[PDB]
Structures are given as C-alpha cells and as structure tokens.
Design an enzyme around this catalytic site. Structure first.
Site, PDB file in Angstrom:
ATOM      1  N   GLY A 116      38.503   0.503  14.161  1.00  0.00           N
ATOM      2  CA  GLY A 116      37.385  -0.404  14.070  1.00  0.00           C
ATOM      3  C   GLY A 116      36.526  -0.297  15.315  1.00  0.00           C
ATOM      4  O   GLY A 116      36.751   0.542  16.191  1.00  0.00           O
ATOM      5  N   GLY A 117      35.522  -1.164  15.390  1.00  0.00           N
ATOM      6  CA  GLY A 117      34.670  -1.166  16.563  1.00  0.00           C
ATOM      7  C   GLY A 117      33.529  -0.180  16.447  1.00  0.00           C
ATOM      8  O   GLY A 117      32.460  -0.510  15.925  1.00  0.00           O
ATOM      9  N   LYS A 118      33.736   1.023  16.987  1.00  0.00           N
ATOM     10  CA  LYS A 118      32.715   2.063  16.909  1.00  0.00           C
ATOM     11  C   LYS A 118      32.320   2.343  15.465  1.00  0.00           C
ATOM     12  O   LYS A 118      31.141   2.568  15.169  1.00  0.00           O
ATOM     13  CB  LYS A 118      33.221   3.340  17.577  1.00  0.00           C
ATOM     14  CG  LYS A 118      33.714   3.140  18.998  1.00  0.00           C
ATOM     15  CD  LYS A 118      34.015   4.464  19.676  1.00  0.00           C
ATOM     16  CE  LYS A 118      34.723   4.260  21.004  1.00  0.00           C
ATOM     17  NZ  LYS A 118      36.053   3.610  20.838  1.00  0.00           N
ATOM     18  N   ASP A 147      40.943   9.507   9.505  1.00  0.00           N
ATOM     19  CA  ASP A 147      42.034   9.282  10.441  1.00  0.00           C
ATOM     20  C   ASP A 147      43.298   9.878   9.847  1.00  0.00           C
ATOM     21  O   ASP A 147      43.357  10.181   8.655  1.00  0.00           O
ATOM     22  CB  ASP A 147      42.236   7.794  10.746  1.00  0.00           C
ATOM     23  CG  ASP A 147      43.031   7.562  12.017  1.00  0.00           C
ATOM     24  OD1 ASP A 147      43.084   8.476  12.866  1.00  0.00           O
ATOM     25  OD2 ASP A 147      43.604   6.464  12.169  1.00  0.00           O
ATOM     26  N   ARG A 162      46.142   2.547  10.233  1.00  0.00           N
ATOM     27  CA  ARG A 162      44.832   2.332  10.832  1.00  0.00           C
ATOM     28  C   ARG A 162      43.718   2.486   9.805  1.00  0.00           C
ATOM     29  O   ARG A 162      42.689   1.812   9.907  1.00  0.00           O
ATOM     30  CB  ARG A 162      44.629   3.288  12.008  1.00  0.00           C
ATOM     31  CG  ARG A 162      45.859   3.433  12.892  1.00  0.00           C
ATOM     32  CD  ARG A 162      45.494   3.758  14.330  1.00  0.00           C
ATOM     33  NE  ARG A 162      45.005   2.591  15.053  1.00  0.00           N
ATOM     34  CZ  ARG A 162      44.487   2.628  16.272  1.00  0.00           C
ATOM     35  NH1 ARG A 162      44.367   3.765  16.940  1.00  0.00           N
ATOM     36  NH2 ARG A 162      44.080   1.496  16.839  1.00  0.00           N
ATOM     37  N   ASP A 216      43.759  14.966   8.407  1.00  0.00           N
ATOM     38  CA  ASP A 216      43.868  15.439   9.781  1.00  0.00           C
ATOM     39  C   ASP A 216      42.529  15.999  10.246  1.00  0.00           C
ATOM     40  O   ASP A 216      41.897  16.787   9.535  1.00  0.00           O
ATOM     41  CB  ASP A 216      44.955  16.507   9.901  1.00  0.00           C
ATOM     42  CG  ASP A 216      45.092  17.043  11.311  1.00  0.00           C
ATOM     43  OD1 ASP A 216      44.629  16.366  12.254  1.00  0.00           O
ATOM     44  OD2 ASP A 216      45.663  18.139  11.479  1.00  0.00           O
ATOM     45  N   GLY A 217      42.104  15.588  11.443  1.00  0.00           N
ATOM     46  CA  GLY A 217      40.845  16.073  11.980  1.00  0.00           C
ATOM     47  C   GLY A 217      40.850  17.558  12.279  1.00  0.00           C
ATOM     48  O   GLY A 217      39.817  18.222  12.150  1.00  0.00           O
ATOM     49  N   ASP A 227      36.783  10.230  18.612  1.00  0.00           N
ATOM     50  CA  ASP A 227      37.563   9.332  19.461  1.00  0.00           C
ATOM     51  C   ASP A 227      39.024   9.738  19.311  1.00  0.00           C
ATOM     52  O   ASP A 227      39.766   9.182  18.502  1.00  0.00           O
ATOM     53  CB  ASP A 227      37.335   7.876  19.074  1.00  0.00           C
ATOM     54  CG  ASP A 227      38.075   6.912  19.976  1.00  0.00           C
ATOM     55  OD1 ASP A 227      38.335   7.268  21.145  1.00  0.00           O
ATOM     56  OD2 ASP A 227      38.398   5.796  19.516  1.00  0.00           O
ATOM     57  N   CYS A 248      39.664   6.380  25.601  1.00  0.00           N
ATOM     58  CA  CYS A 248      39.978   5.104  26.241  1.00  0.00           C
ATOM     59  C   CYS A 248      40.962   5.285  27.395  1.00  0.00           C
ATOM     60  O   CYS A 248      41.993   4.619  27.461  1.00  0.00           O
ATOM     61  CB  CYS A 248      40.528   4.131  25.207  1.00  0.00           C
ATOM     62  SG  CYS A 248      39.505   3.965  23.727  1.00  0.00           S
TER      63      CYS A 248
END
Ligand SMILES: Nc1nc2c(ncn2[C@@H]2O[C@H](COP(=O)(O)OP(=O)(O)OP(=O)(O)O)[C@@H](O)[C@H]2O)c(=O)[nH]1
Ligand SMILES: [Mg+2]
Ligand SMILES: [Mg+2]
Ligand SMILES: [Mg+2]
Ligand SMILES: [Mg+2]
Ligand SMILES: [Mg+2]
Ligand SMILES: [Mg+2]
Ligand SMILES: [Mg+2]
Ligand SMILES: [Mg+2]
Ligand SMILES: [Mg+2]
Ligand SMILES: [Mg+2]
Ligand SMILES: [Mg+2]
Lengths: 137, 95, 327, 95, 41, 52
Positions: free
Chosen positions: C128-130, C147, C152, C180-181, C198, C253
């Site tokens: 979440g957030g971004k 993701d 998540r 998977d990215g 991220d 982060c």
RNA sequence: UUAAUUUAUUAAUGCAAACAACCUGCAUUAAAAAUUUCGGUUGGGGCGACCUCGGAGCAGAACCCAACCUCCGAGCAGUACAUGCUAAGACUUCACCAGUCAAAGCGAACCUCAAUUGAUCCA
RNA sequence: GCCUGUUUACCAAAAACAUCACCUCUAGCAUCACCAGUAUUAGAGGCACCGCCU
RNA sequence: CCGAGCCUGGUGAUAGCUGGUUGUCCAAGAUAGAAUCUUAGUUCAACUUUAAAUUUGCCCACAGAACCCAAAUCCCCUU
C-alpha cells in the site's frame, strides 16, 4: 512507619549496606518524601538498565534527581548510542559517560559535552518519551 | 468469636443418627468474626451519681467497656434486669 | 535473543561508518516514534478532508513543494510537532477519507511524476501507500501492480477496496498480480512508460520495531545475504519492462549504500552488458532542494536521493533513484 | 465407572451421561449436537439448523451409555406432558 | 398484565413502523443524492 | 477491522440478531425480518458484542 | 530456579479487637520453605524449524492411499440483512465428534471461493 | 598449593577443604547457646601466610 | 547397602514395563485406518467368533464414469 519502610526498601529490596543507607539519607533527604515503588523503580533503573553499582549510586547522588529527568537524559543517550547497558559480564563496547556528566550537569552542558545534539531535538525527544510513558501506563 | 461454615455440604444423617464427617467436611470458610461487628451498648441502672451519665435509678446505655470496667465493678451501676428495674420503680414511686 | 537487537547491532556497525556523525541522530530518530502523513483520498471528498486536516493544523507538504517547484495532497504536521493524525474513517462516498502513510514514502511517486495518461507498473510495491498514491494520480492508461506475496496482495486489494472506487478499479485500469518481478522482463518488455520498483529490503525501521518476521533474524540469514542480488534482478526486470525513453524509480526503505547505490549501479551495468540497454540516471537535486523544507536528506549521496529520519522530521528512511531508459 | 460401590455394593451411574443424554425406553439415546451454542455468527443457516436438532446415537454409543447408566434410568416413566412420549416406543420396525 | 403490556408496546411500535421505515429509506436516498452532488462538485 | 454488533428490533419485540460492521463505520440501522411480528422492521445497533 | 500453585509457618507492618505493650481476627509485604511438572517430530549438540486447515509432486482412468520430504497459501475479507422457518432424501476425509447438498412446504421477493478455523465444562 | 593439618570408612589424599593474615556484611546488648561475653566484642561470609608496585 | 537411616503400618502401594498364567479333544479364525502428553498404551472403526432374522451375495454382457491437454478401476443382465 514511613521512615522505617523507606529504610527497609533501601536495605532489603535495594541491598544497600547500613552505612550506604545512612549516607543516602544524609545526602538525599528528598528520598524520605519520595514514595515507595517510585524509589525502587529509580534504583533499579540505575542498577539494571544503567548498570550502576551501589557504591556509585551512593557516591553520586543519583537518588536526588527525579525519575523524569533520569529517564529523559539516559534514554536519549541510549538511543543516540552514547550510553550502553553493561552485558552479562559487565562489559561495554565504549565506556559509558559518568553519572555526574549525565544528571548533575545542566541541560545545555549535557546536550553539548555528552549528547552532542540540539536542544530542539532534545525537546522533541522529551515530548515523545512523555507520550510513550503515558501510553505505557 | 470466629464463625465458620463448611465448604462441602454434609449429607443428612437422619433423626437419631449422627452425621458422618470426612476430610472435606473439615474445610471451612470464615463467614464472620464477631469481634469486628459494630459495637453495641449495655443497659444499666445507676445506683450512685456518676459524671456525664446520670444520677441514680435511670436506665443508661453505656459503652460495654465502661459498664464492665468501672460502673459494675465499682458498684456505681447494676444490671438492667427486670428485678432491678422493678425495685427502682418502687423506689421512684415511693420518693 | 531479539532480532531487533541483531538489527540494531548490524545497523550500528554499518551505518556508523557510513554516516559518521549523523548516525547518532539517525539512530535516535529510528528508535523514536515515526512521523505519519495523511494522504487525502482524491476519490473521496478531498476538499472537505483537506479542510478538516488544515483545521487539525497540518499542511500539504506537496502543495508547498509545488509552490516553488518552478496531483497529490498529503498533509503533515510542522517540524518538531509530534501530533498524531486522527484515525481515518469512511467518508460519505463509502471510501476512507485519507490514508496514514509515511510522508517520505510519497516522494518516490512524486519524483516519478506520472504524466496525464501514462501506463504504469509497480513491479513489487505491494505494501500500500505508493500504490494508492499512484492510483490517486492520473495513471488512467492502466497500472499493473505485481507482488510475489499473496498476503501482501490481499492487503493491497483490501486497501484498494476501501479507498479506490470500484468504478475506477473495474476496468483494466488496475491489474493486481501475484507473480515474480524477475520474470516480468520476459513477460512484458518495453511496455510501461512509468515503472516503480520498490524491492524488498532491510526495512530498517520495521526491522528495528517489529520482532515478527524480522529480516535480521538468524533463520532468514540466506535471504538477508542474497537480498542485493534479488534487488538487482528486480530492478533489471523493471528496466527491461519500461519503454525506451520511459522512466523508472527504484525505491528502498533502508539506509544501506549497498542496498541502494550499489544496487542501482549494478542494475545499470547488468542491463547495459547482458541486454545491451543504456539507462541514464536523472538528476533529483532540484527535487531535494524543493522537498528539503519538510524532509532532511543525506547530502552525501552519489546516485539518487535519501530521506534520512530525523527527530524534527521522522519521515525516513527512504532512498529513491530516478532512471530514464535512453535506449 | 464404579461397578460395586463401597457403601451399597451396587453399580453406580455416571451422572455426566444423565446430564447430557436422553434415553428413550425403546433403547435409543438422544443428544444435542456439539457446538450448537458456539459462534453462531459464523455458521450458515443450514449449519445452525443442523446443530439445533436432537439426534440419535450409534449402537455402540448406546451400548456404552447403557453400561454407564443403571437400570433406574431404563424404566417406564409416565410423565404428565412428556414431549418424547410418542418417541418412547418404536413402530413398524422390521429387525 | 405483562402480556397486555407487551401487546400494546408492540402495537405502538408497529403503528410508528411504516413512518419510521419511510423516513429511514428517505434518509438513505438523500445521503446517496448528497454523495452524487459532491461527486458533481 | 470488523466488529460483531447486536441489532435489536425496533418493533418493541425482544428480537435481536448479530451482524458485522466496520468499527470505523457509523452505527447500523437496517431493515430485517422480525419472526415475532412476522414482518420486516427496522433494527438498530445496540451494543458491540465483540471485536473480530 | 525470573516453571506452576500456595503462605499453612516465621518476621514485620496496617486495620479491627482490648485498653502503650501482649493476645486474637483480617489483610499486605518478605524470608523461608511445601506440592507438582517438565508435550511431540527433527543421529546427538547449538541455533532453529514444525504440530491445525487448503493446493501441487501424487496415484496417470470410481474413491482412498507416496508418510518423511520439495514447496505455495489460511487463520480473512467483501456483499446482504428472508445471510428467515421448516422439511423428503442423500453425501461425508475411511471410527465417533464434526462437516456437506437438498426436493416439497410456510413466509418473502418477482451469499463468494481453496483453506479463512476450536469440542465439553466454565464464565 | 604458602606452610603443619583435613577429606570421599570400602577404587580418587589431590591442585580440593581448612589454615594464620587480610577483606566484606550484620549487631549497642544481660540470667540456658552466642555469654555468665559487650565493637580491640560476637556472628555470617570471601580469599588465602608474609612481601611488593600501581 | 545414606542425593536423605532403620523398623513397623497405610500395603496385596502403583507399575501402559519384565516374567509367569496348570486336563483331553474338535471346530471357525490374519495387517484399513482415525484420535490420543500419542505411537511399549487405549477408544472407535476394520477384521475375527458365536447365535438369530431375512434375501439376495460374489463372478459379471452391453451401456456408462472430464476437460484442463499403461496395467487397470468402478458399475453391472446373464451365468
Ligand atoms: N469457551 C471458552 N471458555 C474459556 C475461554 N477462556 C477461558 N475459558 C474457560 O476457562 C478455562 C481456561 O481457564 P484460564 O486459562 O484460567 O482462563 P483465562 O481467561 O486465561 O483466565 P481466568 O479468567 O483467570 O480463568 C477454559 O477451559 C474454559 O473453561 C474462552 O475463550 N472460551
Ligand atoms: Mg432412613
Ligand atoms: Mg464416514
Ligand atoms: Mg597443601
Ligand atoms: Mg601434609
Ligand atoms: Mg573431621
Ligand atoms: Mg576411598
Ligand atoms: Mg587411596
Ligand atoms: Mg546402613
Ligand atoms: Mg501389582
Ligand atoms: Mg481349523
Ligand atoms: Mg505406553
């Protein structure tokens, strides 16, 4: 009964020798007014979290100061990394600052010589710590 | 006096038989300690004038300590029995 | 044996060297309470919620930044103020009025600067957030949020249900995936005009606070050690996906030079060698100056920008690097 | 259970069985469904209806309950308005 | 006495019920209209 | 999260049923079928039973 | 022993009782002790991991079965408030417990999908 | 390990235990121990003679 | 014969553990799982035995049992 229970807290629950207790009464009369429980918390804060032994707790009038000031300054230094609680062996990576250098010195001297931070940051930390204590209680 | 009560009820014994108790029937809980009850007063009839209570032949509610420690031992008062009340009644009506 | 204490030991022994005299301040800020920002839900009664926050005495750091820059609204308290925003509640429109998220976490999206009608990818950002900020932005040409963690993903779905209207989310405007990215480069290439990567990191603050699932726990030593490789792979996948001339923002982060600057540089090198694609790192110095009044930045940074947590502004940590795929 | 009591030499009844099961004189044992009072907010209406029902027991379960209870519980009871009076006997049963 | 108290209380509540339901539904509809007006801006 | 709440019949009967609503959401008023009155009637949230 | 449960016993105090002390009752705090226990898998040891539920390897095709292992997930959320009541007949994780589907009927209108959970007693 | 001594009678006699010396804690006191004693005293304990530097 | 003496008593302690469990003869009689402080045990199931009631039991011809993309199995009239 009040005086006797103060002395008994200092002796049995704080393991201060008789001479140590007499010197504590001589140097910090405010301990008598201070309520039980709070005094034990202050002493155990010095003993466990700060790693200060009875001879030092007596030599430096630690019990004279207030728990609010003690927690403020000590936790500020601990989170800054300056202070470090001794390990099980009683050893620290860096020698801890002296109790006189923490409590006896004024706020500005404590923040400059020892903490080496800004008064603004100290005020912010004090407010945050007060809020944390209120939430904990 | 300490007043106690069994935790475990005792089975009925009968009419002429006696109850049969066991280990669990010896377990008690304190229902009341009479010594902690509020103090009451003792009724006495004075025989001699005594300060701040009365003069003679008047029923008075005095603290049990005073009644049992000073008045009765020293004869300044007598128990408020029916006989004493009657006798002091005759005394009053004769006076 | 606290994994929190393990994280403290590692962060000391590394960041003390990295930052010198700034490490004590960063340490106290990280160990203190985290300053939160209130991102007003643009879909909800944005003006009314903004008025209520301003009455609560917050101010829109994004608005003041755009003031001197020469569509997002997040309110934060003044420097030194530790006031907490009231918990967000559903609005009249059935959606939550605002989201309580770290202000620094918004800087990656703002730097990404979504142009009107841009196709957007969120390679692994699913806390979440971004993601919600991107949705509230004007990425009307669809947004693919991927993701690897179904938990998540479910959390992201719940926050989207609470904030983003179903009318907005129904179409292909939002595509949430549990893949998977790293495979994403092969899955799609030269597709997205804007990408946000991220990567999983040490999440310094969360590692220091939450004991559960702490990256610095012994059982996760292998994952902690291979983290740089995984981050490089994910950033390479995002760079492959982005269109030529497209923009990507790599966010972390953590304070770790290893996990931020060496990660971006290794991604650039690997992409330029293995796949023969050139990427140029954009200059975010103007971004730093514009947002300096609200966030304290690590002035000594080579590539990208780093919001460091200070007591006067406990908004960090947040590293973000902007990269345009020239080829 | 207690096959021979120490005071009477009789077979005792497991009162946990009496507190939970109903015996129909025909030999069937009726019971409630476990969890019929638990967390009904997360149970579907069909599941709640199934749980709210009175249910017969197995042959082996009935044999166990018969062993665990004494003959007094296996007698004819002509209660006034017993809801189970009709169920106390079987009809049209072949083997 | 208890039976008639229950009956008359139920009667009063039922008498109020249609108007209460109408008011509640009107309130929901007007809230929806206000939401649409806010969307229009 | 969500909370379990006791919706109580507004028809004066003691009928009640438990529903789930978001804690942050406003108290609940809801049409529901009342078996005692044998009719749909309003129910109003009375108290939070538990938090889930 | 900073394992659980106790203070029966001593030492203090406090409140009652009784006329400062002693004694008794009730509390609190310590010292001293007292009773009891120390689940399971993972060659041992350290640090770990795991214990319930769902899906794949996985039975090539009715059902069930590959434990140990490789893994990937769940301990919800969303809608609705008839998500009401009843009831034939059936399925069922190899027992039981529990868990499923459901005609017809009354009354109304004219759930969703992997798991998403917990018995009795007792409150 | 200072020393003389003590110890697992019946597998260990030792570097273990004790030990003078030194150190720490507790106690201001009578008619049954401590003690018919009173702070240079008594009890509890650490360590190990002595001697040195800091 | 002391990490808690010896004797008596509670005491025929308890032991899911070890050991033992005595005339003749005939008959039926073998590995499915589940739960469990549970895997040295037990309860249910399955199997086994006896007695009783009734009628179908086994073998099995067609026909039939999925898309995703081998062997066989189930079901089953006759016999
Ligand atoms: N159904 C149910 N019974 C409970 C629950 N909690 C406790 N109980 C009952 O109480 C027993 C557990 O006792 P405790 O462990 O002392 O419960 P606790 O709530 O932690 O503490 P106490 O209130 O001091 O008993 C259970 O076996 C039940 O009898 C609960 O959540 N549900
Ligand atoms: Mg009789
Ligand atoms: Mg079955
Ligand atoms: Mg020697
Ligand atoms: Mg010798
Ligand atoms: Mg000797
Ligand atoms: Mg020997
Ligand atoms: Mg020898
Ligand atoms: Mg002997
Ligand atoms: Mg035996
Ligand atoms: Mg044979
Ligand atoms: Mg066993």
């Amino acid at each position: 009964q009040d005086i006797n229970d103060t002395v008994r807290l200092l002796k049995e629950k704080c393991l201060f020798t008789v001479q140590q207790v007499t010197k504590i009464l001589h140097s910090c009369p405010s301990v008598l007014r201070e309520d039980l429980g709070q005094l034990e918390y202050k002493f155990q804060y010095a003993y466990f979290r700060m790693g200060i032994k009875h001879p030092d707790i007596v030599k430096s009038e630690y019990l004279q100061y207030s728990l609010t000031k003690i927690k403020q300054r000590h936790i500020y230094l601990e989170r800054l990394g300056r202070y470090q609680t001794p390990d099980k062996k009683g050893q620290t990576q860096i020698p801890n600052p002296l109790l006189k250098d923490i409590l006896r010195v004024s706020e500005a001297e404590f923040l400059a010589r020892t903490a080496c931070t800004s008064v603004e940051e100290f005020q912010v930390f004090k407010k945050l710590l007060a809020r944390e204590e209120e939430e904990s209680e | 006096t300490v007043i106690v009560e069994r935790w475990w009820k005792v089975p009925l014994a009968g009419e002429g038989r006696k109850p049969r108790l066991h280990r669990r029937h010896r377990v008690y809980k304190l229902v009341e300690d009479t010594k902690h009850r509020p103090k009451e007063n003792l009724e006495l009839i004075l025989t001699q004038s005594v300060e701040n209570v009365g003069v003679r032949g008047d029923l008075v509610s005095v603290k049990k300590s005073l009644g049992r420690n000073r008045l009765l031992p020293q004869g300044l008062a007598v128990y408020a029995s029916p006989e004493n009340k009657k006798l002091f009644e005759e005394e009053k009506l004769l006076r | 044996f606290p994994a929190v204490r393990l994280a403290l030991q590692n962060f000391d022994m590394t960041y003390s060297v990295q930052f010198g005299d700034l490490w004590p301040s960063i340490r106290v800020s990280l160990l203190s309470e985290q300053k939160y920002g209130a991102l007003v839900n643009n879909f909800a009664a944005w003006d009314h919620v903004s008025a209520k926050l301003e009455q609560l005495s917050a101010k829109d750091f994004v608005n003041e930044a755009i003031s001197h820059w020469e569509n997002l609204r997040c309110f934060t308290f003044d420097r030194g103020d530790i006031s907490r925003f009231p918990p967000a509640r559903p609005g009249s429109l059935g959606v939550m009025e605002y989201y309580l998220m770290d202000a620094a976490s918004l800087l990656p999206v703002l730097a990404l600067g979504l142009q009107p009608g841009d196709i957007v990818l969120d390679l692994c950002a699913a806390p979440g957030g971004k993601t919600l900020a991107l949705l509230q932005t004007g990425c009307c040409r669809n947004l693919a949020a991927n993701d690897l963690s179904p938990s998540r993903i479910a959390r992201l779905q719940k926050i989207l249900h609470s904030y983003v209207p179903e009318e907005i989310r129904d179409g292909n405007q939002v595509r949430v995936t549990s893949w998977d990215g790293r495979k994403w480069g092969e899955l799609e290439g030269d597709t997205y005009d804007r990408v946000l990567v991220d990567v999983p990191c040490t999440t310094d603050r969360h590692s220091l606070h939450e004991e559960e699932n702490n990256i610095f726990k012994r059982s996760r030593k292998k994952e902690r050690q291979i983290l740089p490789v995984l981050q490089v792979q994910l950033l390479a996948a995002g760079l492959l996906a982005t269109k030529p001339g497209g923009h990507v923002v790599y966010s972390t982060c953590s304070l770790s030079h290893l996990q931020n600057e060496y990660v971006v540089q290794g991604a650039i090198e690997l992409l330029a060698n293995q796949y023969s694609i050139q990427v140029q790192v954009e200059d975010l110095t103007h971004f730093r100056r514009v947002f300096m009044d609200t966030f304290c930045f690590f002035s000594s940074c080579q590539v990208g920008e780093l919001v460091i947590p200070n007591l006067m502004a406990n908004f960090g940590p947040m590293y973000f690097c902007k990269m345009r795929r020239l080829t | 259970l207690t096959y021979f009591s120490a005071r009477k030499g009789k077979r005792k009844t497991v009162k946990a069985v009496i507190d939970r099961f109903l015996r129909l004189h025909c030999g069937l044992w009726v019971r409630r469904k476990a969890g019929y009072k638990k967390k009904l907010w997360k149970k579907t209406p069909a599941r709640k209806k199934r749980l709210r029902e009175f249910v017969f027991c197995n042959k082996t379960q009935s044999k166990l309950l018969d062993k665990m209870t004494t003959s007094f519980w296996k007698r004819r009871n002509w209660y006034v308005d017993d809801p189970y009076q009709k169920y106390h006997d079987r009809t049209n049963l072949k083997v | 006495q208890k039976r008639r108290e229950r009956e008359q209380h139920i009667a009063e509540c039922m008498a109020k019920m249609p108007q209460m339901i109408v008011n509640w539904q009107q309130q929901q509809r007007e809230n929806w209209e206000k939401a649409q007006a806010d969307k229009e801006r | 999260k969500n909370i379990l709440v006791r919706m109580v019949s507004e028809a004066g009967t003691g009928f009640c049923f438990n529903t789930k609503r978001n804690r942050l959401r406003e108290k609940l008023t809801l049409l529901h079928y009342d078996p005692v009155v044998k009719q749909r009637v309003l129910f109003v949230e009375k108290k939070k039973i538990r938090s889930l």
